[PDB]
Coordinates of N, CA and C and ligand atoms in Angstrom, one line a residue:
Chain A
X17 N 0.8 -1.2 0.0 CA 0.0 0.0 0.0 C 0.8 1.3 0.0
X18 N 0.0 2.5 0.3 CA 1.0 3.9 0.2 C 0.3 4.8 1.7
X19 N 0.9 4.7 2.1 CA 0.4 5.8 3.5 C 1.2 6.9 3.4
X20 N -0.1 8.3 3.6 CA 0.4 9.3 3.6 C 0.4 9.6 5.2
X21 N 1.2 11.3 5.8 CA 1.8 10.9 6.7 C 1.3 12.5 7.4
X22 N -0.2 12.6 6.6 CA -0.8 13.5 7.5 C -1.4 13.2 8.7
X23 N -1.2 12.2 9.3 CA -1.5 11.1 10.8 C -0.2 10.1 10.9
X24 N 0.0 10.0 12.3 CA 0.6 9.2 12.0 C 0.6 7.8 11.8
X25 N 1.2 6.8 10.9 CA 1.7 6.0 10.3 C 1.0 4.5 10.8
X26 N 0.4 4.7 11.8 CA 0.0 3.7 12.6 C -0.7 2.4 11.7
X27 N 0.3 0.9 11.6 CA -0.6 0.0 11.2 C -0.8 -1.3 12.3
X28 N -1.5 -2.1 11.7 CA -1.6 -3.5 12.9 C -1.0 -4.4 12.0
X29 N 0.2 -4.9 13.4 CA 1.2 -5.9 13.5 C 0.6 -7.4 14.3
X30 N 1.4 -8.2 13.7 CA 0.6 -9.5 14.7 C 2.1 -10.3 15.2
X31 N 1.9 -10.8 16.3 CA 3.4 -10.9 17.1 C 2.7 -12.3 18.3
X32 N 3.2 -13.0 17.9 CA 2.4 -14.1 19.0 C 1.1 -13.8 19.2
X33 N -0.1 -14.4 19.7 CA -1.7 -13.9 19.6 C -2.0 -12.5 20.2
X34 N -1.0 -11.5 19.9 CA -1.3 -10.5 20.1 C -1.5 -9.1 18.9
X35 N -2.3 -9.6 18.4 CA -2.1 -8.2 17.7 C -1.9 -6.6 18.3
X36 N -1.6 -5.9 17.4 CA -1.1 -4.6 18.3 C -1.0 -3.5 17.1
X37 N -1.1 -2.3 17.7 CA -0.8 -0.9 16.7 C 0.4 -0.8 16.7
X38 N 0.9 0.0 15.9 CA 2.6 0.3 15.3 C 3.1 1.3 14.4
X39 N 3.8 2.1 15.2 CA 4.1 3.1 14.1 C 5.8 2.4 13.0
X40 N 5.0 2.9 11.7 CA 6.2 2.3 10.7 C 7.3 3.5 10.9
X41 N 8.3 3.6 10.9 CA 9.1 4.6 12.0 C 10.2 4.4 10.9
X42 N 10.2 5.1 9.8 CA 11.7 5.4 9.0 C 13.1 5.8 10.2
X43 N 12.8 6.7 11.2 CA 13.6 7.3 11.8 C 14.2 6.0 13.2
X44 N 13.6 5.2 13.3 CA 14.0 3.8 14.1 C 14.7 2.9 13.7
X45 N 16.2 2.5 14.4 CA 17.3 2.0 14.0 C 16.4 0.4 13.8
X46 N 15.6 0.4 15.1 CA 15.5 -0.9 16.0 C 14.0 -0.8 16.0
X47 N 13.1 -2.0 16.1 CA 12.0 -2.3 16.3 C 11.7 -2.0 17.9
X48 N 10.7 -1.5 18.4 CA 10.6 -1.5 19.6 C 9.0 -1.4 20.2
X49 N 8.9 -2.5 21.2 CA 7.5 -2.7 21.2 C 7.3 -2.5 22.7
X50 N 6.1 -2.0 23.3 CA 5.2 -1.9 24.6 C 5.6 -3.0 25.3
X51 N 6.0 -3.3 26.6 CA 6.0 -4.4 27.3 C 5.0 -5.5 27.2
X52 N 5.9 -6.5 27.2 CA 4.9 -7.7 27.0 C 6.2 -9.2 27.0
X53 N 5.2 -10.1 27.6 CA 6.1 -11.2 28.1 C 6.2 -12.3 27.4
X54 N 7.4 -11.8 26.2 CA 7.5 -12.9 25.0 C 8.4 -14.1 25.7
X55 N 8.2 -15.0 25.1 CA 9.1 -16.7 25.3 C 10.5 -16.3 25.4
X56 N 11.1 -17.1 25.8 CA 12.8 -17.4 25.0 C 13.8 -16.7 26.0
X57 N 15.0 -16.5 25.1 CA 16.5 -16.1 25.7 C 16.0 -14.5 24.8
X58 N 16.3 -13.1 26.2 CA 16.9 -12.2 25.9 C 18.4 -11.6 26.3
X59 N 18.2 -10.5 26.1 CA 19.3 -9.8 26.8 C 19.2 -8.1 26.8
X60 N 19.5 -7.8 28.1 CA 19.4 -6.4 28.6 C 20.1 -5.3 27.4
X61 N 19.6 -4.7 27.0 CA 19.9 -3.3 26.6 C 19.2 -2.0 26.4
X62 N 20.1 -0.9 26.4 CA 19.8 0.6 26.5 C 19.5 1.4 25.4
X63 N 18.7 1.9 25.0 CA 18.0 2.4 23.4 C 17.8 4.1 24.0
X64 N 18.2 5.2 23.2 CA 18.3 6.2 23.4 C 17.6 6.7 22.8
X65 N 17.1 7.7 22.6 CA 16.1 9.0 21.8 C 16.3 10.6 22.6
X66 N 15.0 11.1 22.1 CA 14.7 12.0 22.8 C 14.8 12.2 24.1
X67 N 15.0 12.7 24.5 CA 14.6 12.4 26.6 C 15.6 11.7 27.3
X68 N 16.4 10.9 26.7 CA 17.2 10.2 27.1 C 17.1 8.6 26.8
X69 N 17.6 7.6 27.6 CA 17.5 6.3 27.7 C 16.5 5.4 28.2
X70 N 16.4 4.4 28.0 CA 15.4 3.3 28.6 C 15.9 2.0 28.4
X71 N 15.7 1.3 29.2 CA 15.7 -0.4 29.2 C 15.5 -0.9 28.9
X72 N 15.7 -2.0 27.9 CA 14.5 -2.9 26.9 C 15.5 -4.3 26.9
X73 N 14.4 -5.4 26.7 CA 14.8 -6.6 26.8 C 15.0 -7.1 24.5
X74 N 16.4 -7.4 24.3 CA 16.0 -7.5 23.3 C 16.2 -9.1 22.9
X75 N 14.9 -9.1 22.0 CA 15.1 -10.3 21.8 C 14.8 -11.1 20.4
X76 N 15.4 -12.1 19.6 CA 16.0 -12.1 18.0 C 15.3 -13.5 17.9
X77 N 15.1 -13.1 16.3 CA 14.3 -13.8 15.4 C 13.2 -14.2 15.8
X78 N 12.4 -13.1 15.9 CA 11.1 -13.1 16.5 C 10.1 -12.4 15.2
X79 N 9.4 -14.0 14.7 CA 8.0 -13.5 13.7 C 7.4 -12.9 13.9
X80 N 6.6 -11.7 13.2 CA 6.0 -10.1 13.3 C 5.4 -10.1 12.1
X81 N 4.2 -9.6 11.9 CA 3.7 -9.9 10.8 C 3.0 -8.1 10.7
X82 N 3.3 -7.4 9.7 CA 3.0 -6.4 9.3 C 2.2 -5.8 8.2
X83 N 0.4 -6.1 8.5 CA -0.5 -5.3 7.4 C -0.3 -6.8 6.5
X84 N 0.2 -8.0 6.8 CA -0.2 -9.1 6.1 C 1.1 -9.3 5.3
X85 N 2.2 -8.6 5.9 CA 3.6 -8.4 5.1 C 4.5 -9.7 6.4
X86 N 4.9 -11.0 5.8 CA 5.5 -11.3 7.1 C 7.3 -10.7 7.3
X87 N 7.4 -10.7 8.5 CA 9.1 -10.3 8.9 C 9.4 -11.2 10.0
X88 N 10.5 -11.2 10.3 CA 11.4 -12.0 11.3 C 12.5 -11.5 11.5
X89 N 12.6 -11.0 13.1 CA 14.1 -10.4 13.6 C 13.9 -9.7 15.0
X90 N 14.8 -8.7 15.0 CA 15.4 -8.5 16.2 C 14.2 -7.8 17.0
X91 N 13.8 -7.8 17.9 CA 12.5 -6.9 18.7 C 13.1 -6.5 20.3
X92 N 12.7 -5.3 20.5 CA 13.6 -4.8 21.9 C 12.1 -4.5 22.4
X93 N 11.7 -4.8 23.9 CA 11.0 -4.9 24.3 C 10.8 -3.7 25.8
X94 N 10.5 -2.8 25.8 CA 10.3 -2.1 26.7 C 9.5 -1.2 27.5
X95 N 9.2 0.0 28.2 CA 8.9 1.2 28.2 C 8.6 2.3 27.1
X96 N 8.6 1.8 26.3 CA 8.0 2.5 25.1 C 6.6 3.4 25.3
X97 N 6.5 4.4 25.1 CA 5.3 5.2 25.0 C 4.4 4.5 23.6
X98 N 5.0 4.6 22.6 CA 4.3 4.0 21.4 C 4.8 2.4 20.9
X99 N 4.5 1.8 20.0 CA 4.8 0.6 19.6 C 5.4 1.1 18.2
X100 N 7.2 0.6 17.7 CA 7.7 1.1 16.9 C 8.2 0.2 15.9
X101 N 8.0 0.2 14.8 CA 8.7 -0.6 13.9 C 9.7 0.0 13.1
X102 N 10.7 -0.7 13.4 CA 12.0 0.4 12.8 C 12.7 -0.2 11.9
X103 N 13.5 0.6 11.0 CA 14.3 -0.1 9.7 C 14.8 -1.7 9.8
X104 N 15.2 -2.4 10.7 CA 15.3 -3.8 10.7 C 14.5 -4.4 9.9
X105 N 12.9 -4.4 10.2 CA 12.0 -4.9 9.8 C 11.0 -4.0 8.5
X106 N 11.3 -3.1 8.4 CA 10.8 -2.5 7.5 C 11.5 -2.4 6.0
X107 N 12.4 -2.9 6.2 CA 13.3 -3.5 4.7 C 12.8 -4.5 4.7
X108 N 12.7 -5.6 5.5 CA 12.0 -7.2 5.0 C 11.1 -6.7 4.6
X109 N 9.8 -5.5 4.7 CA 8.8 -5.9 3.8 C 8.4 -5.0 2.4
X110 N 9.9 -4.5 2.8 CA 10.3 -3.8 1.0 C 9.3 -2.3 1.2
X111 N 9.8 -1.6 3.0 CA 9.3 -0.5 2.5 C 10.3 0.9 2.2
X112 N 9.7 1.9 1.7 CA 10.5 3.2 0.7 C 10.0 4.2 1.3
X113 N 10.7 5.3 1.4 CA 10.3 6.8 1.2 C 9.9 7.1 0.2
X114 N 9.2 7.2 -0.6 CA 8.8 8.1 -1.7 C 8.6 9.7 -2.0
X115 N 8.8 10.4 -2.3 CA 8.7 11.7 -2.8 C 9.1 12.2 -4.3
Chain B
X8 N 12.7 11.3 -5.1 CA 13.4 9.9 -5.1 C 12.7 9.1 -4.3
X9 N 13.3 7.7 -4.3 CA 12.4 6.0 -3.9 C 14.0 6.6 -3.0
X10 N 13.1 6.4 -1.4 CA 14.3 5.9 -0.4 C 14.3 4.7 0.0
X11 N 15.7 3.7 0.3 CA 15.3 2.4 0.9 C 16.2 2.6 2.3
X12 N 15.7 2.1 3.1 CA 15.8 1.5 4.4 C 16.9 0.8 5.1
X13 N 18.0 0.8 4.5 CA 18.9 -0.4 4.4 C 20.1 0.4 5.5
X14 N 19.9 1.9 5.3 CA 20.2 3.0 6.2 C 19.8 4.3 6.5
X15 N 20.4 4.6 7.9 CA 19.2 5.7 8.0 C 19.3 6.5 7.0
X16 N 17.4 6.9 7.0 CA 17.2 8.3 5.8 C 17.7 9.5 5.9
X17 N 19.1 9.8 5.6 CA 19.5 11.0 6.2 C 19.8 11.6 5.2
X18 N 19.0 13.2 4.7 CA 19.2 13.6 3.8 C 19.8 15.1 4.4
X19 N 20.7 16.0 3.3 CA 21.1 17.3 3.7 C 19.7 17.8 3.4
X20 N 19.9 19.2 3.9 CA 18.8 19.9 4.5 C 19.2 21.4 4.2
X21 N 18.9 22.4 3.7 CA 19.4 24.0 3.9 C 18.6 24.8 4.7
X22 N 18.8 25.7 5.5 CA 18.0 26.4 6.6 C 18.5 27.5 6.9
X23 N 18.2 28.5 6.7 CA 19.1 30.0 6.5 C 20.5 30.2 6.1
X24 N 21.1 29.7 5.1 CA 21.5 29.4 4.5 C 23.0 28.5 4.4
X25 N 22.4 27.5 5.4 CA 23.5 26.9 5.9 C 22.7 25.0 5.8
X26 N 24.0 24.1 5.8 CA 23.7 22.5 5.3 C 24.2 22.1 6.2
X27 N 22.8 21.0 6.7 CA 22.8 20.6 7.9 C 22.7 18.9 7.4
X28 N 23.1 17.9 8.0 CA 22.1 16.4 7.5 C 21.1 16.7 8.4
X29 N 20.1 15.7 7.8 CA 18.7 15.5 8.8 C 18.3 14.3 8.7
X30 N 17.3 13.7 9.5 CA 16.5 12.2 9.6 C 14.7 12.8 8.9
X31 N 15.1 11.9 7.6 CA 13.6 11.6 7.2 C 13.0 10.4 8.4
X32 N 12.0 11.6 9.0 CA 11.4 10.9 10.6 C 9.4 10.3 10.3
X33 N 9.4 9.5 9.6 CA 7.7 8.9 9.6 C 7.6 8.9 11.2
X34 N 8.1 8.6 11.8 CA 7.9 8.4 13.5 C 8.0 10.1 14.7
X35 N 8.0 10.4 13.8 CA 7.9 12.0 14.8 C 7.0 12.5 14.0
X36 N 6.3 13.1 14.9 CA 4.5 14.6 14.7 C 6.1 15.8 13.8
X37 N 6.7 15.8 14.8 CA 7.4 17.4 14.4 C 8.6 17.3 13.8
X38 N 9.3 18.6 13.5 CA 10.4 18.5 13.1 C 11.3 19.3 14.3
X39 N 12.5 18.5 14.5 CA 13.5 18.8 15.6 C 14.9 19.1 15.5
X40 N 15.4 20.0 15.2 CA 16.6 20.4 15.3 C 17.5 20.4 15.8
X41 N 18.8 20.3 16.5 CA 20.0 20.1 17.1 C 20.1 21.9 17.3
X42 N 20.6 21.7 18.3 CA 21.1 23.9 18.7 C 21.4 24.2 17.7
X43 N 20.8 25.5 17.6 CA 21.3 26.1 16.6 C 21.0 27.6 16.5
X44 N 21.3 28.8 16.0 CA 20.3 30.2 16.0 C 19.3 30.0 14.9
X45 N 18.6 30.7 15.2 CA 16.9 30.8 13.7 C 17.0 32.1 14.5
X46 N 16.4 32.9 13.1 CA 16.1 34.6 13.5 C 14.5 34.2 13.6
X47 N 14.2 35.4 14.4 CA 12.5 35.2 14.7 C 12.2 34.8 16.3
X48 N 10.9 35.2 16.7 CA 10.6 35.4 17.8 C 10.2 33.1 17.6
X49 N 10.7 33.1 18.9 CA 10.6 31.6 19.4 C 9.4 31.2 20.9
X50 N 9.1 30.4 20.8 CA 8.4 30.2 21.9 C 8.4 29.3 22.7
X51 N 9.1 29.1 24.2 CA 9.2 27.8 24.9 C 8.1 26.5 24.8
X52 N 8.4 25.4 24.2 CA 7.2 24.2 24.5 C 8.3 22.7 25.0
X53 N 7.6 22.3 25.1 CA 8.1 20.7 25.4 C 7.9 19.7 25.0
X54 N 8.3 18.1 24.3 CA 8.2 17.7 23.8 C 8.6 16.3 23.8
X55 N 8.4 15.2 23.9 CA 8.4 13.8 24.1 C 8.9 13.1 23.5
X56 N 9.8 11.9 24.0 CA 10.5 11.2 23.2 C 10.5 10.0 23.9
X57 N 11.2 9.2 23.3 CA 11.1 7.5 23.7 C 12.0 7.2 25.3
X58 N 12.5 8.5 25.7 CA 13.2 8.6 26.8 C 13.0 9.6 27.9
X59 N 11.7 10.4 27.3 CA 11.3 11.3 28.3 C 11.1 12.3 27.4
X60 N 10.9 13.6 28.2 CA 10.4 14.6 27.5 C 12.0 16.6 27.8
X61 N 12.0 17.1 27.0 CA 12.7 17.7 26.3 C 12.2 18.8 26.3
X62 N 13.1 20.4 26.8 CA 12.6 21.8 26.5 C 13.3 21.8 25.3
X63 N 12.3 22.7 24.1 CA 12.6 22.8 22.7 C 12.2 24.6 22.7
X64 N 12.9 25.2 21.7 CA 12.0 26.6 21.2 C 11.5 26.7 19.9
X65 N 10.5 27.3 20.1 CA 9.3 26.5 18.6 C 9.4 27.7 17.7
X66 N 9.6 28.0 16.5 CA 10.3 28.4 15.3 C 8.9 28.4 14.5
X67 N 8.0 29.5 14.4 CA 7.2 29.4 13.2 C 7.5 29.9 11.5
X68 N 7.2 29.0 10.8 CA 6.8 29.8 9.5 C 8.2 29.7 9.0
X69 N 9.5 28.6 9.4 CA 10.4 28.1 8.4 C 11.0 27.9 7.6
X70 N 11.6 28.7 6.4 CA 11.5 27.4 5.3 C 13.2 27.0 5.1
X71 N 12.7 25.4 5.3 CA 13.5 24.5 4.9 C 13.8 24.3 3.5
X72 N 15.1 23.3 2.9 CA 14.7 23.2 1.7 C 15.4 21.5 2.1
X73 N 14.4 20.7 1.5 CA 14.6 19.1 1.6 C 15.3 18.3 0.7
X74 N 16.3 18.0 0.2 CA 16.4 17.5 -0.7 C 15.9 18.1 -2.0
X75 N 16.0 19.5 -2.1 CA 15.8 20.2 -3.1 C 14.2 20.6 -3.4
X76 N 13.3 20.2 -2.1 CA 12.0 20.5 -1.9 C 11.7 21.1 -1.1
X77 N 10.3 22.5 -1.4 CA 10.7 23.6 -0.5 C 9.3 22.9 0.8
X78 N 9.5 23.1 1.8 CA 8.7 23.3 3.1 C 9.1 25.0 3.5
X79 N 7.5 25.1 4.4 CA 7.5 26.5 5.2 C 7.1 26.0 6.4
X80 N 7.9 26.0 7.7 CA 6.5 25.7 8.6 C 7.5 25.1 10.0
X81 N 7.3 24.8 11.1 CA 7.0 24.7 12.6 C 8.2 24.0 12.3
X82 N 9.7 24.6 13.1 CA 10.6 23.7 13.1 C 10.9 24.2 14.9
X83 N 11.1 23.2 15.7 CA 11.9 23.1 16.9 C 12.9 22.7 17.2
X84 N 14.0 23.5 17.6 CA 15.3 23.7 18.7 C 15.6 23.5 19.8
X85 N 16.2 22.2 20.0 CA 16.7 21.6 20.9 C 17.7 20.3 21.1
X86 N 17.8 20.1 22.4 CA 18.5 18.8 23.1 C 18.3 17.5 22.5
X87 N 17.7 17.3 20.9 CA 17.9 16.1 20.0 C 18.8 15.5 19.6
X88 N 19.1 14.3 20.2 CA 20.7 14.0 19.3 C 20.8 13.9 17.8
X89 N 19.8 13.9 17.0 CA 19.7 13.8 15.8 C 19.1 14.8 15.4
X90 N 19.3 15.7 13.7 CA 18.5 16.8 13.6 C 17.1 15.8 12.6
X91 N 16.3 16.1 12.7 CA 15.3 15.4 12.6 C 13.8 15.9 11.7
X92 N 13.4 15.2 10.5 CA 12.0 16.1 9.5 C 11.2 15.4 10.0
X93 N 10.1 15.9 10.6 CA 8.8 15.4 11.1 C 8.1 15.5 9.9
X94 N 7.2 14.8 10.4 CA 5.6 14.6 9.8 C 5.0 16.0 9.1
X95 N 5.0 17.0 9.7 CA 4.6 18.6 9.6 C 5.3 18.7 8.2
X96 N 6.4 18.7 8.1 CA 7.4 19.0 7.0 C 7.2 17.7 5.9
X97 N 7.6 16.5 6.2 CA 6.8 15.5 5.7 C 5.9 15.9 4.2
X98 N 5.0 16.0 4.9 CA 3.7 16.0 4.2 C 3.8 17.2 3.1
X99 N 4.4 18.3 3.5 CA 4.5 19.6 2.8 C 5.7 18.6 1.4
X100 N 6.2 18.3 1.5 CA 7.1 17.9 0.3 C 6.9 16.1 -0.7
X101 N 5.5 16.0 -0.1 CA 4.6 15.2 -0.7 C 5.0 13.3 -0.5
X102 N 5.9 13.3 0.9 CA 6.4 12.4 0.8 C 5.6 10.9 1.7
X103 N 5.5 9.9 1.4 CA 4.9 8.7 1.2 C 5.3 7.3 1.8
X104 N 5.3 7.1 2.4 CA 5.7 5.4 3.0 C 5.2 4.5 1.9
X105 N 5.5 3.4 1.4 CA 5.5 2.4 0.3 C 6.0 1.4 0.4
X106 N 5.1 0.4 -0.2 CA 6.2 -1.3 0.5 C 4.4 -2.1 -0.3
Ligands
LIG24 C1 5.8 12.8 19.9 C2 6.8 12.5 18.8 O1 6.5 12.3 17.6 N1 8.0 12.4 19.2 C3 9.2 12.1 18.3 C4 9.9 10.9 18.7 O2 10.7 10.9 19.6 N2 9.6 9.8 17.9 C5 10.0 8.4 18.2 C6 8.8 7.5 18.6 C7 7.9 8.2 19.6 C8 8.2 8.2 21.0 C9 7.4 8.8 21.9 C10 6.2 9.4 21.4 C11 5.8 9.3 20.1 C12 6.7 8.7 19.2 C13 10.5 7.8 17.0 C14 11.6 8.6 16.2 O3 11.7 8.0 14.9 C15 12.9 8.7 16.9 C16 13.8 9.7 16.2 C17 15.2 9.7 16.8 C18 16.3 9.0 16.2 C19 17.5 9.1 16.8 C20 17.7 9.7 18.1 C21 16.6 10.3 18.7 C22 15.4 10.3 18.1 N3 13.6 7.4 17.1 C23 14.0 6.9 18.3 O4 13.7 7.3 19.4 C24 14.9 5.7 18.2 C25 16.2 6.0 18.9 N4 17.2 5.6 17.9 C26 18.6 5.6 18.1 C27 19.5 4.7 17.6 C28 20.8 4.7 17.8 C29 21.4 5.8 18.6 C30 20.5 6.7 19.2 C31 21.1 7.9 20.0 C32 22.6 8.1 20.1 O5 20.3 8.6 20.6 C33 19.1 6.6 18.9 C34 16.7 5.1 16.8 O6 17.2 4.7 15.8 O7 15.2 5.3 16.9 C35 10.1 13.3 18.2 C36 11.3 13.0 17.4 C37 9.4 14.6 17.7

């Protein structure tokens, strides 16, 4: 599809039986999603932005399914205000800036 | 141009008549600047990030030039580690998420 970007970007992702909102985030290194208690081996790391730092559990090759587009990879799991999907995942499903 | 994802969207940017890089930001409302002077009356606001929130000074009636596309309009100055094109500016230069 083409989303314009007078709202923001917000689509539904599906991530274990949770579906969830997501902003598609050109400007996000890293995927980063609202707390929630996925399976498996992570590991502790610190993701920076605006405002400073936060804590996030990251954790790899994890299926994500975006607008019916599938992806698989790295997801940091934190304190997030919004739910972010960042360039990692947004190349697997072949998306572009346009102008 | 078709941007891809593979790295960050960083494109040069001109702004009174000086070349800055910037982040093509789908994931930010606004556009945010790194310190800098702008002539023109400014106005204290604050502003939110994935780490907290941020005093900025709000810059009306701007014009940028994007990648050789003109925007006019609401740029903020501040404590951003990256200088950064929101959504506001975005849209003025007709730009599109695609995949
Ligand atoms: C309300 C709003 O739109 N806020 C924006 C914002 O912070 N947007 C965030 C997501 C968000 C958070 C809270 C509320 C709403 C929306 C997403 C941005 O794309 C943001 C841009 C950015 C990029 C780099 C540094 C600071 C800010 N992205 C991120 O926060 C993360 C941080 N990040 C990153 C990666 C590596 C190093 C660093 C450093 C050194 O800070 C940051 C990254 O790639 O994406 C501002 C930029 C205006």
């Amino acid at each position: 599809p083409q989303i314009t970007l007078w709202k923001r970007p917000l689509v539904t992702i599906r991530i274990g039986g949770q579906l969830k909102e997501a902003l598609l985030d050109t400007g996000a290194d890293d995927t980063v999603l609202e707390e929630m208690n996925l399976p498996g081996k992570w590991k502790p790391k610190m993701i920076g932005g605006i405002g400073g730092f936060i804590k996030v559990r990251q954790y790899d090759q994890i299926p994500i399914e975006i607008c019916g587009h599938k992806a698989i990879g790295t997801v940091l799991v934190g304190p997030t205000p919004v739910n972010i999907i960042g360039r990692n995942l947004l190349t697997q499903i072949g998306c572009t800036l346009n102008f």
